[PDB]
């Protein structure tokens, strides 16, 4: 049901990027491995949504 | 300079608070008012250096979960300009002046003089710890060296000193233009425990008596003045409530430039011309 009903989807998950400065917290805004939001994240997987 | 109080507020509160937790008998004596059982309570779960829990300190709004049983969270506030300087000159220098350091060092022998080194070019001496000099011990300063007179001190050929000084950028002339500021930082200890957070609020009132002598404030972030709040639950829809009493601490600083000059006048010079009409 879910697979004839649901579109295709890239689904990546969410981690902490370990750039986050060790005291203000806040992320670097330079960072490549996160454009600047905090949140870094693994290689895409294919579902269904 | 450009300043920005709760980052100095940070790196001052951080190093200050893990060197009380690691001594029990200073919490012992900061906690003496308090009842017997939430002072051993405190210092059996966060003090000493065995101890298991922990206490953090970081700014508001982070994106990940904090250590709500024991949290000084750090919150910039308000602020206005209170006193202006005529030109707004706040000061004006023949040498561009760096920040005020203090630094240990030790007198050694070099050609009959004693000489006390230090890590930076020295711009300005304010104070060598512990010595007057007289005329006669004919004291110099050169680059990042201080030099004094063997001759009739050579009892002090290894003596330990503390200089106070000030780094010196470069050789240039300008005017420091620049207002000053009063501004406020609000500081919270959050704990899932009242009992915790009123400790919270004991120790953070002794680190900023304690901080009001440092050279920092001494220097800038004048007139400390410290305001509380009530004690009151901070969230209040978890699986239990997290409790906080806020303080306000507020500072008079200089907000300032260096305006460099580069014209230089290094002769004048006289001439009569002569008119005939
Ligand atoms: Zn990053």
């Given at each position: 049901?879910?697979?004839?009903?649901?579109?295709?989807?890239?689904?990546?998950?969410?981690?902490?990027?370990?750039?986050?400065?060790?005291?203000?917290?806040?992320?670097?805004?330079?960072?490549?491995?996160?454009?600047?939001?905090?949140?870094?994240?693994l290689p895409p997987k294919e579902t269904i949504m | 300079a450009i300043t920005s109080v709760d980052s100095y507020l940070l790196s001052e509160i951080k190093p200050r608070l893990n060197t009380v937790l690691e001594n029990c008998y200073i919490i012992d004596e900061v906690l003496k008012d308090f009842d017997y059982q939430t002072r051993e309570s405190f210092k059996?779960?966060?003090?000493?250096?065995?101890?298991?829990?922990?206490?953090?300190?970081?700014?508001?709004?982070?994106?990940?979960?904090?250590?709500?049983?024991?949290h000084y969270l750090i919150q910039l506030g308000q602020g206005q300009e209170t006193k202006n300087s005529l030109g707004s000159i706040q000061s004006s220098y023949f040498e561009a002046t760096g920040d005020t350091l203090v630094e240990s060092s030790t007198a050694i022998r070099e050609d009959d003089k004693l000489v006390f080194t230090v890590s930076k070019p020295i711009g300005e001496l304010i104070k060598v710890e512990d010595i007057e000099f007289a005329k006669y011990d004919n004291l110099q300063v050169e680059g990042n060296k201080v030099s004094f007179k063997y001759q009739t001190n050579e009892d002090y050929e290894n003596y330990n000193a503390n200089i106070i000084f000030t780094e010196k950028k470069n050789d240039s002339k300008?005017?420091?233009?620049?207002?000053?500021?009063?501004?406020?930082?609000?500081?919270?200890?959050?704990?899932?425990?009242?009992?915790?957070?009123?400790?919270?609020?004991?120790?953070?009132?002794?680190?900023?008596?304690?901080?009001?002598?440092?050279?920092?404030?001494?220097?800038?972030?004048?007139?400390?003045?410290?305001?509380?709040?009530?004690?009151?639950?901070?969230?209040?829809?978890?699986?239990?409530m997290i409790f906080g009493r806020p303080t306000i601490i507020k500072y008079t600083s200089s907000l300032d430039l260096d305006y460099t000059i580069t014209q230089d006048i290094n002769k004048l010079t006289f001439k009569e011309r002569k008119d005939w009409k």
């Open positions: 049901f879910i697979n004839d009903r649901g579109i295709k989807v890239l689904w990546e998950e969410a981690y902490f990027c370990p750039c986050l400065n060790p005291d203000t917290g806040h992320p670097r805004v330079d960072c490549p491995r996160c454009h600047g939001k905090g949140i870094a994240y | 059996e779960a966060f003090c000493g250096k065995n101890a298991q829990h922990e206490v953090t300190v970081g700014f508001n709004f982070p994106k990940f979960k904090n250590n709500y049983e024991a300008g005017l420091v233009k620049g207002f000053t500021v009063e501004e406020q930082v609000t500081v919270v200890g959050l704990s899932f425990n009242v009992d915790v957070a009123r400790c919270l609020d004991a120790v953070l009132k002794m680190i900023l008596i304690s901080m009001r002598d440092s050279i920092e404030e001494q220097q800038t972030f004048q007139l400390q003045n410290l305001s509380f709040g009530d004690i009151a639950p901070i969230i209040e829809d978890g699986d239990s």
